[PDB]
């Protein structure tokens, strides 16, 4: 049971470094550009809703 809990913790840190890799993937692609456009229009709609 102790190792089961440990394995869950190990799983969490393993899954953490995969996020770091995915972060590098998002910032590399022109998803980096396209999501800035998405944020821009999203902010336009939101800020208009103020």
């Amino acid at each position: 049971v102790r190792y089961e809990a440990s394995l869950r913790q190990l799983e969490q840190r393993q899954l953490a470094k995969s996020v770091i890799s995915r972060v590098q993937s998002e910032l590399g692609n022109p998803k980096f550009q396209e999501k800035v456009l998405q944020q821009s229009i999203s902010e336009i709609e939101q800020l208009l809703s103020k």
Partner: protein
Amino acid sequence: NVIQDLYLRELKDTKLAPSTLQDAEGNVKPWNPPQKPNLPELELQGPEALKAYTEQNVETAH
């Protein structure tokens, strides 16, 4: 949003394959099952005992 997308992508596209039972076995206590509390031998056999008790006992008051 894009945050959700990033996560979705990460989780979906990056899958772990869990560790073997053997690796777990090392990291846990293995188990050796204790067998038999032993059967002792019959104590104070023979008429050595019978004679010993009858003869030895006589120590009573006056």
